[PDB]
Symmetry: C3
Subunit: 358 residues, 3 copies
Amino acid sequence: TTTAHSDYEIILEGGSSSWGQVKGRAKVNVPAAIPLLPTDCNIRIDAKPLDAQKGVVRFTTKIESVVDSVKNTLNVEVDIANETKDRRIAVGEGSLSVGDFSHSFSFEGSVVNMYYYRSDAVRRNIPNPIYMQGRQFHDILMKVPLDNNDLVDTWEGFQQSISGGGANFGDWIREFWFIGPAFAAINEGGQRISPIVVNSSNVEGGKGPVGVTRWKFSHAGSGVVDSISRWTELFPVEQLNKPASIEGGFRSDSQGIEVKVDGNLPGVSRDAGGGLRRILNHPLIPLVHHGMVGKFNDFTVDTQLKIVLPKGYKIRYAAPQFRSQNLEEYRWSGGAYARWVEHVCKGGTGQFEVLYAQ
Amino acid sequence: TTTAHSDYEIILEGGSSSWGQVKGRAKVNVPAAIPLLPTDCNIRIDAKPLDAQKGVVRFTTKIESVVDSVKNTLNVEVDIANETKDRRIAVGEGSLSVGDFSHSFSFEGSVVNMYYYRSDAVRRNIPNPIYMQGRQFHDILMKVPLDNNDLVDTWEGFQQSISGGGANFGDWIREFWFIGPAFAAINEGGQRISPIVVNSSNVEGGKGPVGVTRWKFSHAGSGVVDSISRWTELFPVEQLNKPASIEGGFRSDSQGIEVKVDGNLPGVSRDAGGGLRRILNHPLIPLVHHGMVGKFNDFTVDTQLKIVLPKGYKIRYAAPQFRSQNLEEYRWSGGAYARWVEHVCKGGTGQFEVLYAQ
Amino acid sequence: TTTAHSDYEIILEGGSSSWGQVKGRAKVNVPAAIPLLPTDCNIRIDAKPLDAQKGVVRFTTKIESVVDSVKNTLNVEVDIANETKDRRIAVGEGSLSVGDFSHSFSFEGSVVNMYYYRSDAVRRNIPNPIYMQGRQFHDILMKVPLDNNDLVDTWEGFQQSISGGGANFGDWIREFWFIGPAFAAINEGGQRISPIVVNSSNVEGGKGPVGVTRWKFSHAGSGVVDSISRWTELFPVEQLNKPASIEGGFRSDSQGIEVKVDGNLPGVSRDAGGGLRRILNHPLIPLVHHGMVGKFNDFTVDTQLKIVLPKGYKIRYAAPQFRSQNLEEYRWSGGAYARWVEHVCKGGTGQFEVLYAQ
Ligand code: BCL
Ligand code: BCL
Ligand code: BCL
Ligand code: BCL
Ligand code: BCL
Ligand code: BCL
Ligand SMILES: [N+]
Ligand code: NA
Ligand code: NA
Ligand code: NA
């Protein structure tokens, strides 16, 4: 049979905390859609508060992949802080490698989230808003040491293209940037990527010569794009009073996919009003984008979810309904929950709400 | 099992009439894709000829919905008339409500449909044309009393945005306008929405102050967009010699969908040439847009269609073929018809033609 | 049951040849998605080297279709040659017919393929690259005798549109050009079509008057578009030391689809490095575009592939693995291969690699 086997667990903190431990595991005997297989990847993301800096988070991520035998890596360390509810700043550094090749980088930037035409008439009438339309402006200064011949060559290639290419450069860069199926995924999610505008390009010297570029773009969304709709929520700095982490890994080939995720992080629950809390609303881009790959083989669901509430708390509402309960432990499987799992794995965004209370 | 149960019925008028009674009912035990559930909605649309006005139709629609407990309404009454085969005019008024908030509006406008590069070489050779490419130009004057503080606030927000925003305003408005999954659906159907151009914005006074805007946009299609391809057909004013109506309602949540539609209206059949008539060609946007939600759960079809021809008329051709017949009554179920139902519910546009004759 | 029955065979040439014989057959009892049925079509494509012209290929194609009873044809004969690895030239002529109407044409043009930002850092590290982003510039001079009244009329319609329409003409032409579902398919594949620019329009005289237009456009891809990513590979002129041909035909209606393809052509295998060869990487646009129709009915796979290697060669790697082997003959069916067939018929691009060696 083609059967998708999966297991998910959430363990929630109580009191004023929004933290939870999250676990997910899945195995399915279908090919992945990658046109190079096997393809394997591990990612780790960490965040900790910085001791001597009020509201600043040290965020790091490490990616390792193997694609048709070729080993790749990316490492990034970044300090991130809000300036206002709309404006966030970042400064960081990192490196990447592909086979025998590597390069490093450093950057700083500002991102301004701008909702379109928000109103109190909406706010006071919609208890759990989902789609929030907006545009999010990036301003980036980046630096790369030109410390091998390929880097020199690519710098020169870009300088000629920018010099010669007027508006075309920043227009046509989008199908370079969003390689492969990434480009189609933009519109799928009601997202838009603006042209790039290059403000300046300079070689400094570092050490050695460094290619320095100041550039800008914006992206927009009609409300599915969670990076815009949930801009403040997705950076839960006030809850980060200790280190948070998540890691995920998958292995895939032309006969199967297997994946594991483990994390401990703020923002797993959220205040729902009225003395209630919910599991955070499911982000929509993961569902819509995974929907672009989840429809290629028929499958049966073999899936269980366990949610462990904080001590003494109880479920107030869940739909699909839990299958069973004992004290803080609630379990879902089969029936309507299994049809919901099938639905979201194929791209559906139907709501599975879980509300609970002290 | 996941089974979709549905039943459809058509009862046709004869002679020179294109009218039919239409009924549809469906129930399916799958979640809807709305990210807020339950979501319920009723719509009623009515059209009647105006006694003292040659070719003018009074068109009304009333929508009531509940989305995550929040009650919404829209009411619109409009007088619509053709000026030429390409140009139609409208004047109307209405109101909307969301929870505790409401506002009213009035408007007038003109819409010009423009096919691209039509030719007699096509006309005389294609017996049943489907894809007709074109662009459809809207010119709108609308008025809203600014009779609560939220309306004042939003007026001021837009005035600043238009003043300050040059071309960006009318560009970026599109992802505000086509909220949520609406934006992606545009391209899915081979449709295009132009930027908005604002011709003027003025507060009048009403009564009290009224926000008045004159603005324009066009939309285009490659031939799937029925609002363009079938522009004259979709407003069957000459057949409307008595009131027409249709109503539909659905209830949905994370475990099921149920829907009912009932109507009596012109345009259910159409002259096919040669002394023949057909059930009107299936519009394609409903199929393509519903295709964006119909692929998220496997289902079995349990579906019957009944078509009742006018007295003495008989089917000349149907594919998929009817299952059974008795006098004017033809029934479809099972076999090829059921595979067609599955197909169109998932987004397929394959032709199911029904031709009949006196 | 809904069952897709299909059979594929590849017979490879050895030595320095990349040629293979290809056969495919399929039958499936589902409706096609065409909104006019039945629809049938045959295509034949032929290529031969020109005796007195070094590197020039005479390429011909003939299409015959019937769509809702209407017979159509297209015939084109073209001489094609590379000037450089990036620039190709063409000169040709042909005719088309629809029912009682026909017209002829002649043309010449140049096409320049331009990859974006290629690098040796990529080249030396990726053994089998797939996604190659780029833009491909067409420059076309075409001539049509205005030798019937419809041609005169359409010429005049276009002259007025171009004269009057500024940038809109070359913008809005895209939804005329990519009729029906073609328009949506562009973005689906990460493809872009630029506006048209018209350089000139003139009536010559021919004979009689001839409408002559010089015009340009580019298309681009993020790497899925094989016409860009595999620009040199897709025109295997150096291997064409004798005539090549392929033919395909299908019949479809609201109850089934049947198709047959037969060809003998260069480029079926390719050097994989290291003394190895592979079956050419599967082109991605056919899979992505067919994916737009392959998801509308559940189906079971009944499918066999046979690959016959050149004498003495053996498979070095295949995933999904072959089912059985005897001497040069390898067969796939069932199991993982059948899940791969289902996957690619629905739009999946997962890699099925076949490597072999002398
Ligand atoms: C620069 C990146 C941005 C950022 C962008 C986003 C975006 C965008 C989203 C979030 C989302 C979340 N973020 Mg944030 N986030 C940042 C910083 C943080 C910090 C911090 C204090 O620094 C914290 C603690 C969080 C915490 C959170 C949670 C509130 C939420 C995920 C909930 C969950 O259960 O996930 C459980 C996790 C899983 C089930 C799967 C995890 C899979 C792997 C291990 C990680 C994701 C990989 C992703 C699919 C692919 C990345 C591709 C890149 C090319 C590398 N983010 C910075 C500022 N964050 C999501 C959300 O729901 O927001 C409302 C979301 O959509
Ligand atoms: C294909 C399956 C679906 C999916 C199916 C489900 C199901 C089913 C359930 C949840 C549930 C939850 N999911 Mg979800 N979910 C997906 C993706 C995400 C992402 C994300 C950033 O991608 C986020 C933040 C969330 C967040 C959430 C919470 C709202 C909630 C509780 C956590 C949980 O049980 O996780 C479980 C963990 C997973 C499902 C693992 C998902 C991992 C995804 C696919 C990303 C892997 C990235 C990979 C390792 C690295 C990529 C690197 C790049 C290639 C460079 N999901 C994918 C796309 N999710 C539960 C819920 O609603 O509780 C109320 C629930 O029952
Ligand atoms: C301002 C709106 C436009 C208009 C736009 C359209 C569009 C667009 C289409 C039609 C279509 C039709 N219209 Mg018209 N139509 C108008 C005025 C009229 C008047 C009239 C004399 O005033 C009449 C009698 C009709 C009659 C008809 C039929 C010829 C045809 C539907 C056939 C059928 O069997 O439906 C049976 C109905 C059903 C199976 C389902 C009905 C569902 C519910 C009850 C109504 C539709 C809701 C829709 C899905 C969502 C609307 C969302 C909005 C945000 C509110 N229209 C005005 C001028 N009409 C369709 C067609 O096929 O044209 C060729 C079509 O695509
Ligand atoms: C998901 C199912 C498919 C669908 C499946 C079928 C099937 C199967 C058959 C038809 C048939 C017909 N359909 Mg259809 N059809 C759909 C949508 C439409 C729409 C439309 C405006 O949406 C129109 C005008 C038509 C028109 C037609 C006629 C050509 C024909 C005879 C009427 C009939 O039997 O209706 C039956 C009525 C329905 C199927 C109900 C459809 C209601 C749709 C989904 C809209 C509901 C709107 C909701 C109530 C309100 C939305 C409000 C907004 C959220 C604000 N269909 C949807 C998208 N249709 C029959 C035929 O071809 O006869 C020859 C036939 O056998
Ligand atoms: C003007 C057209 C272009 C061109 C554009 C393309 C494009 C684009 C592609 C190819 C591809 C291929 N081309 Mg080339 N090709 C041209 C000239 C040639 C000549 C020659 C010496 O003149 C030769 C021998 C080839 C040979 C080849 C093969 C290397 C490869 C197909 C492999 C296979 O097994 O197919 C076996 C075939 C089948 C399984 C199915 C065949 C179906 C039918 C009979 C033909 C295709 C119809 C297509 C779906 C629809 C066309 C619609 C039009 C509106 C008419 N091409 C010219 C220069 N060629 C493909 C590839 O993989 O490249 C890497 C590809 O994507
Ligand atoms: C829906 C089914 C899928 C598909 C499923 C498979 C499967 C399954 C297998 C291959 C395999 C192969 N396919 Mg494939 N393949 C498709 C389309 C293509 C096209 C193309 C130009 O459309 C090309 C060049 C190829 C090329 C290739 C080679 C890489 C490989 C060996 C040839 C073979 O066995 O062909 C077999 C022939 C076919 C599948 C026939 C495909 C015909 C397509 C649908 C086009 C028909 C055009 C029609 C006749 C005319 C249209 C005219 C217009 C309407 C005007 N495929 C379609 C879209 N292909 C085999 C492989 O990977 O070996 C290692 C293998 O096992
Ligand atoms: N899609
Ligand atoms: Na390096
Ligand atoms: Na009010
Ligand atoms: Na002719």
